[PDB]
Subunit: 319 residues, 4 copies
């Protein structure tokens, strides 16, 4: 392989620039030229391709976001879309692609390898719901942004303001809510996967108030419901003043923690090793503390699941 | 004075433990005994008073919250409530009191100076709307919590998610929104002291989008309205995906910055100084970079105002 | 059982309060009383044992250090020290003990296990060199503390001050230096387990300066030598102004990150589980992302190793 | 004025990008063209000047360092250096210059104005010793970097490791040590402006140890001496294990706090107004909470002073 490309697709997340750096530096280390593709699959179709040199990934390791930008491109689902993209790859002499992003970025990688363009997928998301990896690049940074908010709520010492509702991200996966709730000492953790009883939530809240819990912290994933309406429901039902924090898109940004930059460096460099040794159609991951790589179609057929032992542990510690 | 008391009241804010510590240590340096009054005015009525030693304020300097707690006391706004407070102060033989808190705790300080009890008021609130001081203890830390959220939102590198609405605290004052917005590069800052046209808000947004401005960040103070409703309305009028963050009670917590710890230290030390030279009925502050002290009643007659030049400057630098 | 005890020993590490919290809450959930032992093995011999209630571990999950304190007990190496240790457990009614700490704390757990006192050892140390676990409680926090300082040094934008030596902890193990340096983009990592050529350190440095590398960050494990001394030799040899940072005990403190609180919570609950099922003389750990428990004497036989692929990859990405 | 230039010189410091951003946006708002001078005075002599558009200062407000770089320039102390400087300025058509940096950059701004080149100096440095301003841009951020290290040291819960020596920057000025020590609760602060007695340091060290003081933190400004040497002597004289942290160049970097971004925004826009309103040869600053502007040569003969009440206050609160 003489010339490869790299691109980021889907929501951006902390650690995409450390994955771009390790892709670019490992490929240049073994004599290969790396072209950055700007604006995901939308810029692949448009021809927004520019050589990357060694020095262009200098000082991006510690930066959030992605310097190659991201964009939604529903035209890449279709056969017309893929042929316009391949024409731009052929025009610049790019023989392989490293694709950093979520589930939808892996669908394009699979379709490109079936049209003769070897591609590897690197899991870039804060949700943790990319199959074939225990941890996605960005998940550890998002947990550290939620627990910063939770620790600051722990300093309040106002007698009549003891009941806090924090709404975190997690439209389909409850990984951010569950690991944050456990790490934050949340009393009630509402995740998409588990069904909850509002009577159980109220009961526990009253039980903690009677034994003098200083703060009662409730975490709601955005996929279950809004914190605001949960907060009005708890105050109405109990008469405890309830404060709501809605973090929103703060969970996506920030300088990456040490675990996401080690992980993005390992995974980005492994994807270049896969392209250099003939393997295309695969996605890298970390499963059982080992660098692993799976065929994309096989990896995408598995479902995301949360650890149920961790969810039961979060209620036992919170009494 | 043989014995003084110290109390915290109103919304807790970062630096209150640094203010309690300089009260304690400054009083003990000059041979005075210091009594902590727990739960604000509510515990003063209750007789929840307790001797504090040198080592009791050790390792609190860098902590958010208040170690003496804060609470609401509706009974202290009546003559009977103020008479029971005095009774407990005379019962412990506390001859003077340092009150740390907002506007509402200043009113109780006033009222106890009228009944023969020397009181000094120390400005502890994150709002910055306490008359007679440029800066309140907790204002600087609450600005750093808000710009931490704004900085994380600036790392998103997604083309379709460009409009961000952040709701900060400050019911009647616009200082947290004005200083946060200037520090974070906000395009539009909505504070209670200025008038906004929704039409000009939209018009700045479209101007910036046309130039290629990467992010459009709108700060909304809570006394203007809700970020949720503004985001809804911005989205509807423009068609731009709008993301809303509501920090809420995160802005009151956290470890105090360097400025809040120095300011609390100086201000609490000055409060003990005034009491030991027989002044009572006063409140300390920092006005024109100098430690100042004012009659509470004359201090509470002034009206809090924001800096129009600084508000003018935030529109010229956000082009 | 009916009564269990918990102790912290060795250098303290962030996450030790989270481990204690999950020890106490997990035993109380199952109906077991938990008694805390102050000052490690010195206070076990001394008699410093006090019952811990549910609310006694409240608001400690997010703090660094350990609330049970830690101490050095030379006496506990002797048979007489062990026999006075068991005297006090038996006088207080304690039938088993959870021990949180390093290498040294595990030896004591072996010795008490061997005299009929069921003990379980929990890995608390910032170093990462406790056999039978991939990660020790405190390791993740210490990595983020070192990368916070390296990120700040990456902002210096002066061209005559491009060479920085950072000296991190790790007497015997180079985990902190290896993970820190891959995560902070260090050019040269000096760890105890790998051999270096000083002249190869000089050649890389020179090479990087020829291409226009902005910074040259060298991480030095404290086991290898002084950062001061290494910085003096780089200046002498190349003539490049060299600046040195010695973090020291900064690396041991701070609020534990999200991974350290999840790891402490899960490992501390696993330790109580083993005591309740009758196992004694075990040490918990996380190996291949799975909770494992090993015999302490079997565990202490292994040698700590660092990943050589991660060391080679660190040299490949810093070109 | 139709075209102005901006340049940063001297050690960099947090908030330099916020001052560059307010220089460029403020000039563009009043229809002026802004050219950036890369590498301080060294790139001024070389003609390393390039136009900056409105969007080239987008996303730098929250970043440390300077995007125009700083470089020592020995040639600009000579008249031909200066005349080459003016030749390049006339060649690009630059009419005025904003110089952001320390004392040394003020020297060149004075000589440029003496050959009829309107220059305004903006105080960028972490040390706080630029005359004419109470606060330099960068000083607030460096104080917060020193208290993050002191805060982490207060978590260690070891009884034999109680005495800690932190060496901070400040060759000629004690501002960083005095404000960090007071904010950190340092027991002994050694700054250039006060005379210390090493017997008085040892006696107050033993007093606190006797009473039960958890920690004994000593701050040493770098201009008084080394932290390592001080550590040796403390342990030699007392016998107490003494741990040293040398922060070094970590104090110059990092994302600027809220006070440094607000200060850089107001000061940099006030520099642009001064050029436009025909007053060159001046330096801006903040004195008694008000934007002031002083002639460069008058400002430069004023001496740097520290508040001695604040120094005395730091020994009174530390008992």
């Amino acid at each position: 392989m003489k010339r490869i490309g790299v691109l980021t697709s889907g929501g951006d997340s902390p650690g995409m620039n450390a994955a771009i750096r390790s892709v670019v530096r490992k490929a240049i280390y073994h004599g290969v030229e790396v072209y950055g593709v700007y604006h995901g699959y939308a810029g692949l179709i448009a021809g927004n391709i520019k050589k990357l040199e060694v020095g262009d990934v200098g000082d991006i390791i510690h930066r959030g976001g992605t310097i190659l930008y991201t964009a939604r491109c529903p035209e890449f689902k279709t056969e017309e879309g893929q042929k316009k993209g391949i024409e731009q790859l052929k025009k610049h002499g790019i023989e392989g692609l490293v694709v950093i992003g979520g589930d939808g970025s892996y669908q394009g990688a699979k379709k490109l390898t079936e049209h003769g363009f070897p591609c590897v997928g690197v899991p870039g998301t804060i949700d943790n719901d990319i199959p074939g990896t225990d941890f996605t690049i960005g998940f550890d940074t998002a947990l550290n942004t939620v627990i910063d908010a939770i620790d600051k709520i722990r300093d309040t010492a106002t007698s009549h303001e003891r009941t806090y509702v924090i709404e975190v991200m997690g439209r389909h996966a409850g990984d951010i809510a569950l690991w944050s709730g456990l790490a934050g000492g949340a009393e009630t953790i509402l995740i998409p996967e588990a069904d909850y009883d509002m009577n159980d939530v109220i009961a526990r809240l009253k039980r903690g108030h009677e034994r003098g819990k200083k703060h009662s912290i409730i975490i709601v994933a955005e996929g279950v419901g809004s914190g605001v309406d949960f907060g009005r429901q708890i105050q109405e039902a109990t008469g405890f003043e309830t404060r709501v924090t809605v973090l929103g898109h703060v969970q996506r940004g920030g300088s990456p923690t040490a675990f996401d930059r080690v992980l993005a460096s390992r995974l980005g460099a492994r994807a270049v090793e896969l392209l250099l040794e003939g393997k295309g159609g695969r996605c890298v991951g970390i499963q059982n503390n080992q660098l692993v790589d799976h065929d994309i179609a096989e990896a995408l057929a598995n479902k995301h699941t949360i650890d149920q032992r961790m969810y039961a542990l979060s209620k036992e510690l919170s009494i």
